[PDB]
Amino acid sequence: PIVQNLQGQMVHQAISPRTLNAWVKVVEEKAFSPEVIPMFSALSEGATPQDLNTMLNTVGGHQAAAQMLKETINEEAAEWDRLHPVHAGPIAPGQMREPRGSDIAGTTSTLQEQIGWMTHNPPIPVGEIYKRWIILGLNKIVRMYSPTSILDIRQGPKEPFRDYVDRFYKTLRAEQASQEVKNWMTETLLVQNANPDCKTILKALGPGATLEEMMTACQGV
Amino acid sequence: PIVQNLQGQMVHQAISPRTLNAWVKVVEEKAFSPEVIPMFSALSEGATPQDLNTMLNTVGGHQAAAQMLKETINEEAAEWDRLHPVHAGPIAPGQMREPRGSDIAGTTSTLQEQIGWMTHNPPIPVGEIYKRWIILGLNKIVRMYSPTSILDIRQGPKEPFRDYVDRFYKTLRAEQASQEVKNWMTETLLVQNANPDCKTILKALGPGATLEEMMTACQGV
């Protein structure tokens, strides 16, 4: 991340060892469950591309996931280069140059360049964009590692309704379908795959019932 | 009660023997069920404190209930004396004096005093206040004699829903909880303690369903 020294200057600060160890635990203990994605977003808060690559080195041990991440990052960098062509001409002395795809990801750039790019009025977030590419890669990995399809999430005969809803929504978050498809799933498949008692109650509740009403009517069933 | 003679004067009339016998039957045959309270209110309609004490003599055989009634009446009389201090000074010749706690209950007062106190423009009801104290005592007795808690009123596997509702509301009337607590009971516990089929139907009906809708949806179940 970026901090301020006693002179009021922006200086890069390395990720603390225990934050890196928390990220390592997340990678090595959660088997790329969907919750890995928010946690990363919390653990890389306000990070620099060098810090993001340091965090990615933990994923580098997982060869398949690391390869998927590298493919996603390369594709995003190519798209960024395509959408941000290198302008030919004079550059203002007070304005910094435009980083390339290999520079925003920190493969070739230096620390001072990223510090200057991130701290500006208005700021151009390179760390945030690299983080978004990382999150895209992580979402792909979570989809790859999902053990069950949403069509296979069925409420158990004695399973409480809240646990079934939690499993259903966790699987839905893992699968990352289209928004309309997700809405159709939450409206139809959740009722369809419930156990007979909750299914009867939800059918009696009618279409268009909110999730709160559904969980209320099935609370102790 | 109070009637009018041929001269247009208010004269006390004794309670008829069959009204007293009806009250005796209520006391001795209904085991201080909640319905004893409305019936008393019907049987003592427009009564004088002497008449109310005559009716209480039937309860005097039931030692515990009579003691509870006497405690309630004494407490109410003490509160009445506290809230109605005896004024020191002149009294208007045309205005009658203020009865005390032992006088409104008819322990020390006479018949003519109560007749004059009750018949006035505007009237000051002493019989009605004594009746309200009696009803407080009777409510305490009904609470004491209640055989079942409201938490123990559960619909039978083959019991019709209307009978379960009647038992539930009778027990609720016996227990005399706070108004908010009673509302919570009628909204939640009635559904909670129903049998599985009616419970499923009521859960499908949703929260905030009126009692009429609940009894309609469970009519033949």
CSV table of C-alpha atoms in Angstrom, one decimal:
chain,number,residue,atom,x,y,z
A,1,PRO,CA,0.0,0.0,0.0
A,2,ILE,CA,0.8,3.7,0.0
A,3,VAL,CA,1.5,5.8,3.2
A,4,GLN,CA,2.7,9.3,4.0
A,5,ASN,CA,6.1,10.0,5.5
A,6,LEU,CA,6.9,12.8,7.9
A,7,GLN,CA,7.8,15.0,4.9
A,8,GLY,CA,4.2,14.6,3.4
A,9,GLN,CA,5.4,12.4,0.5
A,10,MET,CA,3.7,9.3,-0.8
A,11,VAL,CA,5.9,6.2,-0.1
A,12,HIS,CA,5.1,2.6,-0.8
A,13,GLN,CA,4.7,0.3,2.2
A,14,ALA,CA,5.2,-3.4,1.9
A,15,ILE,CA,2.4,-5.9,2.9
A,16,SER,CA,2.9,-7.0,6.4
A,17,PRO,CA,4.0,-10.6,6.9
A,18,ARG,CA,0.8,-11.5,8.8
A,19,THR,CA,-1.4,-10.1,6.0
A,20,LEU,CA,0.5,-12.2,3.5
A,21,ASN,CA,0.2,-15.2,5.8
A,22,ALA,CA,-3.5,-14.7,6.0
A,23,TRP,CA,-3.7,-14.6,2.2
A,24,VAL,CA,-1.6,-17.8,2.1
A,25,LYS,CA,-4.0,-19.5,4.6
A,26,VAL,CA,-7.0,-18.4,2.4
A,27,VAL,CA,-5.4,-19.8,-0.7
A,28,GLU,CA,-4.2,-23.1,0.9
A,29,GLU,CA,-7.1,-23.8,3.2
A,30,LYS,CA,-10.3,-22.8,1.4
A,31,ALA,CA,-10.0,-24.7,-1.9
A,32,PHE,CA,-11.0,-21.7,-4.0
A,33,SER,CA,-14.5,-21.4,-2.5
A,34,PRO,CA,-16.4,-18.3,-3.5
A,35,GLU,CA,-15.5,-16.6,-0.2
A,36,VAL,CA,-11.9,-16.5,-1.3
A,37,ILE,CA,-12.9,-13.6,-3.6
A,38,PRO,CA,-14.2,-11.1,-0.9
A,39,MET,CA,-11.4,-12.0,1.4
A,40,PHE,CA,-8.8,-11.2,-1.2
A,41,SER,CA,-10.6,-7.9,-1.9
A,42,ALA,CA,-10.3,-7.2,1.8
A,43,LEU,CA,-6.6,-8.3,2.1
A,44,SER,CA,-5.4,-6.4,-0.9
A,45,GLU,CA,-7.2,-3.1,0.1
A,46,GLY,CA,-5.3,-0.2,-1.4
A,47,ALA,CA,-2.5,-2.3,-2.7
A,48,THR,CA,0.1,-1.7,-5.4
A,49,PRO,CA,0.7,-3.9,-8.5
A,50,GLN,CA,4.0,-5.2,-6.9
A,51,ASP,CA,2.0,-6.1,-3.8
A,52,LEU,CA,-0.6,-7.9,-6.0
A,53,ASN,CA,2.2,-9.9,-7.7
A,54,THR,CA,3.6,-10.7,-4.2
A,55,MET,CA,0.1,-12.0,-3.3
A,56,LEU,CA,-0.1,-13.9,-6.6
A,57,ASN,CA,3.1,-15.7,-5.8
A,58,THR,CA,1.1,-17.7,-3.2
A,59,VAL,CA,-1.3,-18.8,-6.0
A,60,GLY,CA,1.7,-19.7,-8.2
A,61,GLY,CA,2.1,-23.0,-6.3
A,62,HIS,CA,-1.3,-24.0,-7.6
A,63,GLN,CA,-0.3,-24.6,-11.2
A,64,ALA,CA,-3.7,-24.8,-12.8
A,65,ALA,CA,-5.1,-21.8,-11.0
A,66,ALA,CA,-1.9,-19.8,-11.6
A,67,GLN,CA,-2.1,-20.6,-15.3
A,68,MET,CA,-5.7,-19.5,-15.4
A,69,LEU,CA,-4.9,-16.3,-13.6
A,70,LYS,CA,-2.0,-15.6,-16.0
A,71,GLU,CA,-4.2,-16.2,-19.0
A,72,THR,CA,-6.9,-13.8,-17.6
A,73,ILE,CA,-4.3,-11.2,-16.8
A,74,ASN,CA,-2.7,-11.4,-20.2
A,75,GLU,CA,-6.1,-11.2,-21.9
A,76,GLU,CA,-7.0,-8.1,-19.8
A,77,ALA,CA,-3.7,-6.5,-20.5
A,78,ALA,CA,-4.1,-7.0,-24.3
A,79,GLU,CA,-7.6,-5.5,-24.1
A,80,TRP,CA,-6.2,-2.6,-22.1
A,81,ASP,CA,-3.5,-2.0,-24.7
A,82,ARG,CA,-6.1,-2.2,-27.5
A,83,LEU,CA,-8.4,0.3,-25.8
A,84,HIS,CA,-5.5,2.6,-24.7
A,85,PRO,CA,-3.3,3.1,-27.7
A,86,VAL,CA,0.2,4.7,-27.2
A,87,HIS,CA,-0.2,8.3,-28.3
A,88,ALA,CA,2.6,9.7,-30.5
A,89,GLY,CA,3.6,13.3,-29.8
A,90,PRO,CA,4.7,15.7,-27.0
A,91,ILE,CA,4.1,14.9,-23.4
A,92,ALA,CA,3.5,17.6,-20.7
A,93,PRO,CA,6.4,17.9,-18.2
A,94,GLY,CA,3.9,18.0,-15.4
A,95,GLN,CA,1.8,15.0,-16.6
A,96,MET,CA,3.1,11.4,-16.2
A,97,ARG,CA,3.1,9.0,-19.1
A,98,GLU,CA,0.5,6.3,-19.7
A,99,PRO,CA,1.4,2.8,-18.4
A,100,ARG,CA,1.0,-0.1,-20.7
A,101,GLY,CA,-0.5,-3.5,-20.0
A,102,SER,CA,2.8,-5.0,-18.8
A,103,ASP,CA,3.3,-1.9,-16.7
A,104,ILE,CA,-0.1,-1.7,-14.8
A,105,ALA,CA,0.4,-5.4,-13.8
A,106,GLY,CA,3.8,-4.5,-12.5
A,107,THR,CA,5.7,-7.0,-14.7
A,108,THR,CA,8.0,-4.3,-16.0
A,109,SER,CA,7.2,-1.1,-14.2
A,110,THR,CA,8.9,0.2,-11.1
A,111,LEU,CA,7.6,1.1,-7.6
A,112,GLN,CA,8.0,4.9,-8.0
A,113,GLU,CA,6.1,4.8,-11.3
A,114,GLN,CA,3.1,3.0,-9.7
A,115,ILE,CA,3.2,5.3,-6.6
A,116,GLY,CA,3.1,8.4,-8.8
A,117,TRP,CA,0.3,6.9,-11.0
A,118,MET,CA,-1.9,5.9,-8.1
A,119,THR,CA,-1.5,9.2,-6.1
A,120,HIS,CA,-2.9,12.0,-8.4
A,121,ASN,CA,-5.6,14.6,-8.5
A,122,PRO,CA,-7.7,13.0,-10.1
A,123,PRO,CA,-6.1,9.6,-9.4
A,124,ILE,CA,-5.8,7.0,-12.1
A,125,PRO,CA,-6.1,3.7,-10.2
A,126,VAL,CA,-3.7,1.1,-11.6
A,127,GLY,CA,-3.8,-1.1,-8.5
A,128,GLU,CA,-7.6,-1.2,-8.6
A,129,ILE,CA,-7.7,-2.3,-12.2
A,130,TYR,CA,-5.1,-5.0,-11.6
A,131,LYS,CA,-7.1,-6.1,-8.6
A,132,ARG,CA,-10.2,-6.3,-10.9
A,133,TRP,CA,-8.3,-8.5,-13.3
A,134,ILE,CA,-7.2,-10.6,-10.4
A,135,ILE,CA,-10.8,-10.9,-9.3
A,136,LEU,CA,-11.9,-11.9,-12.8
A,137,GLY,CA,-9.2,-14.7,-12.7
A,138,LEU,CA,-10.3,-15.8,-9.2
A,139,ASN,CA,-13.9,-15.9,-10.3
A,140,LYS,CA,-12.9,-18.2,-13.2
A,141,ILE,CA,-11.0,-20.4,-10.8
A,142,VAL,CA,-13.9,-20.5,-8.3
A,143,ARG,CA,-16.2,-21.5,-11.2
A,144,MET,CA,-13.7,-24.2,-12.2
A,145,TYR,CA,-13.4,-25.6,-8.6
A,146,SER,CA,-17.1,-25.6,-7.9
A,147,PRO,CA,-18.0,-29.2,-6.7
A,148,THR,CA,-21.7,-29.1,-7.4
A,149,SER,CA,-24.0,-27.6,-10.1
A,150,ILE,CA,-26.8,-25.4,-8.9
A,151,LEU,CA,-29.2,-27.9,-10.4
A,152,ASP,CA,-27.8,-30.4,-7.9
A,153,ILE,CA,-28.4,-28.3,-4.8
A,154,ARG,CA,-31.4,-30.0,-3.2
A,155,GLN,CA,-32.8,-29.5,0.3
A,156,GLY,CA,-32.4,-32.5,2.6
A,157,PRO,CA,-35.4,-34.2,4.1
A,158,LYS,CA,-34.4,-32.9,7.6
A,159,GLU,CA,-32.3,-30.0,6.5
A,160,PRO,CA,-33.4,-26.6,7.8
A,161,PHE,CA,-34.5,-24.2,5.1
A,162,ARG,CA,-32.0,-21.5,6.0
A,163,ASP,CA,-29.1,-23.9,5.4
A,164,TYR,CA,-30.6,-25.0,2.1
A,165,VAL,CA,-30.9,-21.3,1.1
A,166,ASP,CA,-27.3,-20.6,2.2
A,167,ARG,CA,-26.0,-23.6,0.1
A,168,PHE,CA,-28.1,-22.6,-2.9
A,169,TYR,CA,-26.8,-19.0,-2.8
A,170,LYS,CA,-23.2,-20.0,-2.3
A,171,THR,CA,-23.4,-22.3,-5.3
A,172,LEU,CA,-25.1,-19.5,-7.3
A,173,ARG,CA,-22.2,-17.2,-6.4
A,174,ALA,CA,-19.7,-19.8,-7.4
A,175,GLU,CA,-21.4,-20.5,-10.8
A,176,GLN,CA,-21.7,-16.8,-11.8
A,177,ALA,CA,-24.5,-17.1,-14.4
A,178,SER,CA,-26.0,-14.2,-16.2
A,179,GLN,CA,-28.1,-11.8,-14.2
A,180,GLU,CA,-31.4,-12.8,-15.8
A,181,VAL,CA,-30.5,-16.5,-15.4
A,182,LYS,CA,-29.6,-15.9,-11.8
A,183,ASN,CA,-33.0,-14.2,-11.2
A,184,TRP,CA,-34.8,-17.1,-12.9
A,185,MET,CA,-32.8,-19.5,-10.7
A,186,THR,CA,-33.5,-17.7,-7.4
A,187,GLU,CA,-37.2,-17.4,-8.4
A,188,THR,CA,-37.9,-21.0,-9.6
A,189,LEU,CA,-35.1,-23.5,-8.8
A,190,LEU,CA,-34.9,-22.6,-5.1
A,191,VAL,CA,-38.6,-23.6,-4.7
A,192,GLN,CA,-38.2,-26.5,-7.2
A,193,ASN,CA,-35.4,-28.2,-5.3
A,194,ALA,CA,-36.8,-27.8,-1.7
A,195,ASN,CA,-37.9,-30.8,0.3
A,196,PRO,CA,-41.6,-31.7,0.1
A,197,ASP,CA,-42.9,-29.8,3.2
A,198,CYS,CA,-41.1,-26.6,2.4
A,199,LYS,CA,-42.0,-27.1,-1.3
A,200,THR,CA,-45.7,-27.3,-0.4
A,201,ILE,CA,-45.5,-24.2,1.8
A,202,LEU,CA,-43.6,-22.2,-0.9
A,203,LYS,CA,-46.1,-23.3,-3.6
A,204,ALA,CA,-48.9,-22.1,-1.3
A,205,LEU,CA,-47.0,-18.9,-0.8
A,206,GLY,CA,-47.3,-18.2,-4.5
A,207,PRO,CA,-45.0,-16.7,-7.2
A,208,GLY,CA,-43.2,-13.5,-6.5
A,209,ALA,CA,-42.8,-14.1,-2.8
A,210,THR,CA,-39.7,-12.4,-1.4
A,211,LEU,CA,-36.9,-14.4,0.1
A,212,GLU,CA,-37.6,-13.0,3.5
A,213,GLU,CA,-41.2,-14.2,3.4
A,214,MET,CA,-40.1,-17.6,2.1
A,215,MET,CA,-37.6,-18.0,5.0
A,216,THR,CA,-40.3,-16.8,7.5
A,217,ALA,CA,-42.9,-19.3,6.3
A,218,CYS,CA,-40.4,-22.2,6.4
A,219,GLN,CA,-38.5,-21.2,9.6
A,220,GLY,CA,-39.2,-24.3,11.7
A,221,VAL,CA,-40.4,-26.7,9.1
B,1,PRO,CA,-81.3,-3.1,42.7
B,2,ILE,CA,-83.2,0.2,42.7
B,3,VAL,CA,-86.8,0.6,41.6
B,4,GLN,CA,-89.4,3.4,41.7
B,5,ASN,CA,-92.5,3.2,43.9
B,6,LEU,CA,-95.9,4.7,43.1
B,7,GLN,CA,-94.8,8.0,44.7
B,8,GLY,CA,-91.9,8.3,42.3
B,9,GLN,CA,-89.2,7.7,45.0
B,10,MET,CA,-86.2,5.5,44.6
B,11,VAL,CA,-86.5,2.4,46.8
B,12,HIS,CA,-84.1,-0.6,47.1
B,13,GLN,CA,-85.4,-3.9,45.8
B,14,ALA,CA,-83.8,-7.2,47.0
B,15,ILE,CA,-82.3,-9.7,44.6
B,16,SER,CA,-84.9,-12.3,43.7
B,17,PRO,CA,-84.4,-15.8,45.1
B,18,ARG,CA,-84.0,-17.3,41.7
B,19,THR,CA,-81.3,-14.8,40.7
B,20,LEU,CA,-79.4,-15.6,43.9
B,21,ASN,CA,-79.8,-19.3,43.1
B,22,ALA,CA,-78.5,-18.8,39.6
B,23,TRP,CA,-75.4,-17.1,41.1
B,24,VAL,CA,-75.1,-20.0,43.5
B,25,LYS,CA,-75.2,-22.5,40.7
B,26,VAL,CA,-72.6,-20.5,38.8
B,27,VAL,CA,-70.2,-20.4,41.8
B,28,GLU,CA,-70.8,-24.1,42.8
B,29,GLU,CA,-70.9,-25.7,39.3
B,30,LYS,CA,-68.4,-23.8,37.0
B,31,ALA,CA,-65.2,-24.2,39.1
B,32,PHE,CA,-64.3,-20.5,38.6
B,33,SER,CA,-64.0,-20.8,34.8
B,34,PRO,CA,-63.6,-17.5,33.0
B,35,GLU,CA,-67.3,-17.5,32.0
B,36,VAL,CA,-68.1,-16.9,35.7
B,37,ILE,CA,-67.0,-13.3,35.2
B,38,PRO,CA,-69.5,-12.2,32.5
B,39,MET,CA,-72.3,-14.2,34.2
B,40,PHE,CA,-71.7,-12.4,37.5
B,41,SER,CA,-71.7,-9.1,35.5
B,42,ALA,CA,-75.1,-10.1,34.1
B,43,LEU,CA,-76.5,-11.3,37.4
B,44,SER,CA,-75.5,-8.3,39.4
B,45,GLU,CA,-76.8,-5.8,36.9
B,46,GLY,CA,-77.7,-2.5,38.6
B,47,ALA,CA,-77.1,-3.9,42.1
B,48,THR,CA,-76.4,-2.3,45.4
B,49,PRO,CA,-73.4,-2.9,47.7
B,50,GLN,CA,-75.6,-4.8,50.1
B,51,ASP,CA,-76.8,-7.0,47.2
B,52,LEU,CA,-73.2,-7.5,46.1
B,53,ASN,CA,-72.3,-8.7,49.7
B,54,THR,CA,-75.3,-11.0,49.6
B,55,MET,CA,-74.0,-12.5,46.4
B,56,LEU,CA,-70.5,-12.7,47.9
B,57,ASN,CA,-71.9,-14.8,50.8
B,58,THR,CA,-72.1,-17.6,48.2
B,59,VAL,CA,-68.4,-17.3,47.6
B,60,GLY,CA,-67.7,-17.3,51.3
B,61,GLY,CA,-68.1,-21.0,51.4
B,62,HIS,CA,-65.1,-21.3,49.1
B,63,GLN,CA,-62.5,-20.3,51.7
B,64,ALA,CA,-59.5,-19.6,49.4
B,65,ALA,CA,-61.5,-17.7,46.8
B,66,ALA,CA,-63.3,-15.8,49.5
B,67,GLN,CA,-60.0,-14.8,51.1
B,68,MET,CA,-58.6,-13.7,47.8
B,69,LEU,CA,-61.8,-11.6,47.2
B,70,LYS,CA,-61.5,-10.0,50.6
B,71,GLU,CA,-57.8,-9.2,50.1
B,72,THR,CA,-58.6,-7.6,46.7
B,73,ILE,CA,-61.6,-5.6,48.1
B,74,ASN,CA,-59.5,-4.4,51.1
B,75,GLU,CA,-56.7,-3.3,48.8
B,76,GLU,CA,-59.1,-1.5,46.5
B,77,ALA,CA,-60.8,0.2,49.4
B,78,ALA,CA,-57.4,1.3,50.8
B,79,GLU,CA,-56.5,2.7,47.3
B,80,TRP,CA,-59.9,4.5,47.2
B,81,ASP,CA,-59.4,6.1,50.6
B,82,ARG,CA,-55.9,7.2,49.5
B,83,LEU,CA,-57.2,8.7,46.3
B,84,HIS,CA,-60.3,10.2,48.0
B,85,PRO,CA,-59.2,12.0,51.2
B,86,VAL,CA,-61.8,13.1,53.7
B,87,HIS,CA,-62.3,16.8,53.2
B,88,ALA,CA,-62.4,18.9,56.4
B,89,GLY,CA,-64.9,21.8,56.3
B,90,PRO,CA,-68.5,22.7,55.7
B,91,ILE,CA,-70.8,20.4,53.7
B,92,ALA,CA,-73.7,21.7,51.5
B,93,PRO,CA,-77.1,20.8,52.9
B,94,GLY,CA,-78.2,19.6,49.5
B,95,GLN,CA,-75.1,17.6,48.8
B,96,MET,CA,-74.6,14.2,50.3
B,97,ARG,CA,-71.3,13.2,52.1
B,98,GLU,CA,-68.6,11.2,50.4
B,99,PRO,CA,-68.6,7.5,51.3
B,100,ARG,CA,-65.5,5.8,52.5
B,101,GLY,CA,-63.9,2.6,51.5
B,102,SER,CA,-65.7,0.6,54.1
B,103,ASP,CA,-68.9,2.4,53.1
B,104,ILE,CA,-68.9,1.8,49.3
B,105,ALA,CA,-68.4,-1.9,49.9
B,106,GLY,CA,-71.4,-1.8,52.3
B,107,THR,CA,-69.6,-3.1,55.3
B,108,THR,CA,-70.7,-0.1,57.5
B,109,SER,CA,-73.1,1.9,55.3
B,110,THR,CA,-76.8,1.6,55.3
B,111,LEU,CA,-79.3,1.0,52.5
B,112,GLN,CA,-80.7,4.5,52.3
B,113,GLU,CA,-77.2,6.0,52.0
B,114,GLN,CA,-76.4,3.8,49.0
B,115,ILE,CA,-79.7,4.5,47.4
B,116,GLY,CA,-79.2,8.2,47.7
B,117,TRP,CA,-75.6,7.9,46.5
B,118,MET,CA,-76.4,5.8,43.4
B,119,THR,CA,-79.5,7.9,42.3
B,120,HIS,CA,-78.2,11.4,41.6
B,121,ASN,CA,-77.8,13.9,38.7
B,122,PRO,CA,-75.0,13.3,37.9
B,123,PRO,CA,-74.9,9.9,39.6
B,124,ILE,CA,-71.9,8.6,41.5
B,125,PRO,CA,-71.9,4.8,41.0
B,126,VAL,CA,-70.9,3.1,44.2
B,127,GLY,CA,-72.4,-0.3,43.2
B,128,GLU,CA,-70.5,-0.2,39.9
B,129,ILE,CA,-67.2,0.5,41.6
B,130,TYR,CA,-67.8,-2.3,44.1
B,131,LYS,CA,-68.7,-4.5,41.2
B,132,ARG,CA,-65.5,-3.6,39.4
B,133,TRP,CA,-63.5,-4.6,42.6
B,134,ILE,CA,-65.5,-7.9,42.7
B,135,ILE,CA,-64.6,-8.5,39.1
B,136,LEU,CA,-60.9,-7.9,39.8
B,137,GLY,CA,-61.1,-10.4,42.6
B,138,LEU,CA,-62.9,-12.9,40.4
B,139,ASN,CA,-60.3,-12.4,37.7
B,140,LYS,CA,-57.6,-13.2,40.2
B,141,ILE,CA,-59.5,-16.3,41.3
B,142,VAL,CA,-60.0,-17.5,37.6
B,143,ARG,CA,-56.3,-17.0,37.1
B,144,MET,CA,-55.6,-19.1,40.2
B,145,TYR,CA,-58.0,-21.9,39.2
B,146,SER,CA,-56.8,-22.1,35.6
B,147,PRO,CA,-55.9,-25.8,35.0
B,148,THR,CA,-53.6,-25.3,32.0
B,149,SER,CA,-51.1,-22.8,30.8
B,150,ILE,CA,-51.6,-21.1,27.4
B,151,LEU,CA,-48.3,-22.7,26.4
B,152,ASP,CA,-49.9,-26.1,27.0
B,153,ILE,CA,-52.9,-25.5,24.7
B,154,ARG,CA,-52.1,-27.7,21.7
B,155,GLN,CA,-54.4,-28.7,18.9
B,156,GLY,CA,-55.2,-32.4,18.8
B,157,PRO,CA,-54.3,-34.6,15.8
B,158,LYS,CA,-58.0,-34.9,14.9
B,159,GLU,CA,-59.3,-31.9,16.8
B,160,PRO,CA,-61.2,-29.4,14.6
B,161,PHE,CA,-59.5,-26.0,14.3
B,162,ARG,CA,-62.5,-24.1,15.7
B,163,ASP,CA,-62.4,-26.1,18.9
B,164,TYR,CA,-58.6,-25.5,19.3
B,165,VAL,CA,-59.2,-21.8,18.8
B,166,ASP,CA,-62.0,-21.8,21.3
B,167,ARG,CA,-59.8,-23.5,23.9
B,168,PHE,CA,-56.9,-21.2,23.2
B,169,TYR,CA,-58.9,-18.1,23.6
B,170,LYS,CA,-60.6,-19.4,26.7
B,171,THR,CA,-57.2,-20.1,28.3
B,172,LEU,CA,-56.0,-16.7,27.2
B,173,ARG,CA,-59.0,-15.1,28.9
B,174,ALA,CA,-58.3,-17.1,32.0
B,175,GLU,CA,-54.6,-16.1,32.1
B,176,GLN,CA,-55.1,-12.3,31.6
B,177,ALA,CA,-51.7,-11.4,30.3
B,178,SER,CA,-50.7,-7.9,29.2
B,179,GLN,CA,-52.3,-6.6,26.0
B,180,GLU,CA,-49.1,-6.7,24.0
B,181,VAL,CA,-48.3,-10.2,25.4
B,182,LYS,CA,-51.8,-11.3,24.5
B,183,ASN,CA,-51.4,-9.9,20.9
B,184,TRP,CA,-48.1,-11.7,20.6
B,185,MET,CA,-49.8,-14.9,21.8
B,186,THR,CA,-52.7,-14.7,19.4
B,187,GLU,CA,-50.3,-13.9,16.5
B,188,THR,CA,-47.6,-16.5,17.2
B,189,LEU,CA,-48.5,-19.2,19.7
B,190,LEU,CA,-51.9,-20.1,18.1
B,191,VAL,CA,-50.1,-21.0,14.9
B,192,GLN,CA,-47.2,-22.6,16.7
B,193,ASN,CA,-49.3,-25.0,18.7
B,194,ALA,CA,-51.6,-26.2,15.9
B,195,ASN,CA,-51.5,-29.7,14.5
B,196,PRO,CA,-49.3,-30.4,11.5
B,197,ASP,CA,-51.9,-30.0,8.8
B,198,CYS,CA,-53.3,-26.8,10.1
B,199,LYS,CA,-49.8,-25.6,11.0
B,200,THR,CA,-48.7,-26.1,7.4
B,201,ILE,CA,-51.8,-24.3,6.1
B,202,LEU,CA,-51.4,-21.3,8.5
B,203,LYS,CA,-47.7,-21.0,7.7
B,204,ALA,CA,-48.6,-20.9,4.0
B,205,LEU,CA,-51.2,-18.2,4.9
B,206,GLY,CA,-48.4,-16.0,6.1
B,207,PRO,CA,-47.9,-13.6,9.1
B,208,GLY,CA,-50.6,-11.0,9.7
B,209,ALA,CA,-53.5,-13.2,8.6
B,210,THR,CA,-56.7,-12.4,10.5
B,211,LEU,CA,-58.4,-15.0,12.7
B,212,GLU,CA,-61.3,-15.2,10.2
B,213,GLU,CA,-59.0,-16.1,7.3
B,214,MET,CA,-57.2,-18.6,9.5
B,215,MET,CA,-60.5,-20.3,10.5
B,216,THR,CA,-61.7,-20.2,6.9
B,217,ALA,CA,-58.5,-21.9,5.5
B,218,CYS,CA,-58.6,-24.6,8.2
B,219,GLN,CA,-62.4,-25.2,8.3
B,220,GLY,CA,-62.5,-28.8,7.3
B,221,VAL,CA,-58.9,-29.8,7.9
